[PDB]
Amino acid sequence: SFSHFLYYLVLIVVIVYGLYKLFTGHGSDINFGKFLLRTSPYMWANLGIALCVGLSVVGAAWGIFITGSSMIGAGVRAPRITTKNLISIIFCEVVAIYGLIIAIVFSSKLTVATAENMYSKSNLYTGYSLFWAGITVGASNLICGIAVGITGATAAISDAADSALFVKILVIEIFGSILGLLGLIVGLLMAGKASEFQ
């Protein structure tokens, strides 16, 4: 595979470069700490906010297509399900709204810091916190949406098979839909002590 070959080549190049720097006495030249300290916290915060919204949306859309495509197929013979299983599509679109919400809350901390107080303890902490909280919310909402959509497709097919089945599969969705909520909560806890850039 071209992708696997590229991955192996990148790994070999990284290993060779690291060994060359280490053996030549310059192992510290590969300083992830300096990279984190000198990379602008603005980049981390904005990447977090963009990835939060984007990944929450990606999971919502991914779930909506999985639930939506299985509702449409099952509704050819049982159109009664179309509106009944639409709650499934609301569990898929709600993660996105969580991400959006987080973006709004995290965007409030995207203030402009002064030149001297740019790479300080508070500003670097705010950058890391908003990057990783956005990553967490976005990935959790991605997983929750794709998983809730897979449950919603099963629920739609079951509802078409038998109406009484739906309420039993919706429970599973309610179990999955909480997974984004938890991520949301955890995100709010990460960026909780983060402050506007100053």
Partner: protein, 36 residues
């Protein structure tokens, strides 16, 4: 789009609160022109 997001706010947020549903639609025996 806004007409259809109003429909969800009614079907999912408003009617989730009081609408039991699952009623029997009223379809009385009536004669209607049936087109071939």
């Amino acid at each position: 789009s806004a007409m259809l997001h109003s429909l969800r706010l009614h079907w999912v947020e408003s009617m989730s609160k009081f609408f039991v549903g699952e009623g029997l639609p009223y379809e009385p025996f009536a004669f209607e022109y049936k087109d071939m």
